[PDB]
């Protein structure tokens, strides 16, 4: 069926001890796969079936009424996880075009991490924390559920899943320890690629 579940760029253990193998397997093979399944079921036989997931999520207001929510939720899930897997790496190095821009705007990388971590922690319920480019400038935003900033005309360049499935097996309630661990596995080359592509 139309959309497909992308492979991880790395093995399921790749991100230990920051994110456990069991979570990487369930999160990818089960959670992300379910979004794909339900997205395909929603769009089957529609003009949407053949669009890129980015163009669908960017333009949710153009979706037929009877599948607006299914597409928002499962289309968003598909997009958000596809970005997430590419944004993680076992060989992270905190350097590059966006890291240099973060240091210029926030003053240091720690000051950016603090704001991101605290916005991430403050997202009540399920959702995501993002670094976005909005009209050429960097901003930190959060979204509920599987909503994505593309829908509001902001390009995501880094995202962190703060649904409890993303962290509960290893960290339980300690979302801030998960958030802290995430910095060790950020693919800043991917961030810089997404930043360069931004419209």
Q: Give 74's DSSP letter.
A: I
Under the binding rule (CB under 5 A), the answer on residue 130 touching Mn ion is no
Under the binding rule (CB under 8 A), the answer on residue 20 touching its own copies is no
How far is it, in rounded angstroms, from Cα 194 to Cα 114? Answer: 22
Q: Is 161 annotated as a binding residue?
A: yes
Instruction: Tell me how many degrees the CA angle 162-165-42 measures, rounded to the nearest 5.
Output: 90
- Candidate ranges 11-19, 29-37, 43-51, 111-119; the one touching its own copies (CB under 8 A): 29-37
Q: Give 32's DSSP letter.
A: I
Q: Binding string, 160-179, against Mn ion, x = CB under 5 A?
A: -x-x----------------
Q: Binding string, 118-137, against its own copies, x = CB under 8 A?
A: ------xxxx----------
What three-state secondary structure class fits 144? strand
What three-state secondary structure class fits 156? strand
179: closest CA among 190, 164, 194, 198?
A: 164
- Which of residues 16 and 164 has its CB atom nearest to its own copies in the complex? 164
How far is it, in rounded angstroms, from Cα 25 to Cα 144? Answer: 23
How far is it, in rounded angstroms, from Cα 187 to Cα 87? Answer: 5
- Which of residues 25 and 110 has its CB atom nearest to its own copies in the complex? 25
Q: Which does 161 bind (CB under 5 to 8 A by kind): its own copies, Mn ion, none?
A: Mn ion
Residue 43, both tokens: 């769009």
Beta strands 155-161; 127-134: pairing state:
antiparallel
- Which of residues 64 and 144 has its CB atom nearest to its own copies in the complex? 144
Under the binding rule (CB under 8 A), the answer on residue 50 touching its own copies is no
Q: Which does 5 bind (CB under 5 to 8 A by kind): its own copies, Mn ion, none?
A: none
Q: Provide, rounded to whole angstroms, the least separation between the CB of residue 196 and Mn ion.
A: 26
Binding site for Mn ion (CB under 5 A): 161, 163
Binding site for its own copies (CB under 8 A): 26, 30-31, 34, 73, 124-127, 144-146, 163-165, 168-169, 172-173
């Amino acid at each position: 069926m139309a959309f497909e579940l992308p492979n991880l760029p790395y093995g399921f253990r790749a991100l230990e001890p920051h994110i456990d193998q069991q979570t990487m397997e369930i999160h990818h093979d089960k959670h992300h796969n379910t979004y794909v399944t339900k997205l395909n079921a929603a769009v089957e036989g529609t003009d949407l079936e053949s669009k890129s997931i980015e163009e669908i999520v960017a333009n949710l207001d153009s979706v037929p009424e009877n599948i607006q929510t299914a597409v928002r939720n499962n289309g968003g899930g598909h997009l958000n996880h596809s970005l997430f897997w590419e944004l993680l790496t076992p060989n992270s190095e905190e350097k590059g075009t966006v890291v240099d821009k973060i240091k210029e705007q926030w003053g240091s990388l720690d000051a950016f991490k603090e704001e991101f971590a605290n916005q991430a922690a403050a997202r009540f319920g399920s959702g995501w924390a993002w670094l976005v480019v909005n009209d050429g400038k960097l901003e930190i935003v959060t979204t509920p559920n599987q909503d994505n900033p593309l829908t509001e005309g902001k390009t995501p360049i880094l995202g962190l899943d703060v649904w409890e499935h993303a962290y509960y097996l290893k960290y339980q309630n300690k979302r801030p320890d998960y958030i802290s661990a995430f910095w060790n596995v950020v693919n800043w080359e991917k961030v810089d690629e997404l930043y360069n592509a931004a419209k």
